[PDB]
Structure 1
Amino acid sequence: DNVPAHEIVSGAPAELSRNRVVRIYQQAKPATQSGEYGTFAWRLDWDIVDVANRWENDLIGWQSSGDYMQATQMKFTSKESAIKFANKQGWDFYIQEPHHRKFRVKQYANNFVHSYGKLKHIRTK
């Protein structure tokens, strides 16, 4: 199922496959934009490490880091491919299943439906 340690032929540090957890997901539809072009690929990136994520240099005020994977992120065409890759490397992962908008029928004419009782609210346009 999962490649153990020390028969990975990549040469990466053992710590990568021992005490690091990656996460696989699809990017969420950004709330700020209506475009959806970034949401189809399956990203893979590493969960952060507490001590080594980022600190502030005491000279010019920069963001120092000891985590060599903080900037790395792979793109895959499909969830199964990402799973296969992570398994072949021996990475512990978690899958975050995507959420989608539930379909509902929208009619422009619905803005002008006659109301037989009291108006619940004044639509304004």
Structure 2
Amino acid sequence: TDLAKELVSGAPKELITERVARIYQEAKAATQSGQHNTETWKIDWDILNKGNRWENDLMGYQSSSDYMQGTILKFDTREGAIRFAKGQGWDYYIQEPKVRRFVKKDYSANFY
């Protein structure tokens, strides 16, 4: 836990001093009634304020310089995500998932 495992991972120093990762649980999509994607905790990185995306003039391609733009880690528990982020010495913040309040729902309430 306290071990600074980033000294041996080989990742560049910019992951620690310049990038911010978000630990979050995916919110339920408003267009679908499934909840499978909300059962896992994920880690992604905030975009670079400049150079995240720019248009290549030759073909209109989406050019980028962020090498972490397409990396999304998967975790089964919130504690596991925190332990891994702490182990790598990342600057992170946790977005607590919104919980749906339970309200009783019955067919009789359509008239009463």
Q: Which bin holds the TM-score, normalised by the shorter protein?
A: over 0.9
Q: Highest relative contact order (Cα 8 Å, sep 6+), 1 or 2? A: 2
Partner of 1:38: 37
* Structure 1 vs Structure 2 CA RMSD: 1.6
Partner of 1:56: 55
Distance in 1 (alpha carbons) for counterparts of 2:2 and 2:21: 14
From the superposition, tell whether residues 81 and 97 of structure 1 become closer, same or farther in structure 2 (CA, over 3 Å). Answer: same
SS of residue in 1 equivalent to 2:37: coil
- Structure 1, unpaired ranges of 5+: 114-125
Tell me the amino acid that sits aligned with residue 65 of structure 1: S
TM-score by length of 1: 0.84
| Residues 1-125 of structure 1 mapped to structure 2, 5 A cutoff | 8-113=7-112
Alpha-carbon distance, 1:50 to partner: 1.1
Alpha-carbon distance, 1:107 to partner: 1.4
TM-score by length of 2: 0.93
Distance in 2 (alpha carbons) for counterparts of 1:102 and 1:38: 19
Percentage of matched positions with identical amino acids: 58
Alpha-carbon distance, 1:44 to partner: 0.1
From the superposition, tell whether residues 15 and 97 of structure 1 become closer, same or farther in structure 2 (CA, over 3 Å). Answer: same
CA contact (8 A) 1:3 1:90 kept: no
Tell me the amino acid that sits aligned with residue 14 of structure 1: K
Distance in 2 (alpha carbons) for counterparts of 1:67 and 1:84: 24
Distance in 2 (alpha carbons) for counterparts of 1:87 and 1:8: 13
Partner of 1:118: none
CA contact (8 A) 1:3 1:87 kept: no
CA contact (8 A) 2:28 2:38 kept: yes
Deviations, residues 25-65 of structure 1 (Å, cap 9, x unaligned): 10001100000010011000000111120000011000000
CA contact (8 A) 1:27 1:38 kept: yes
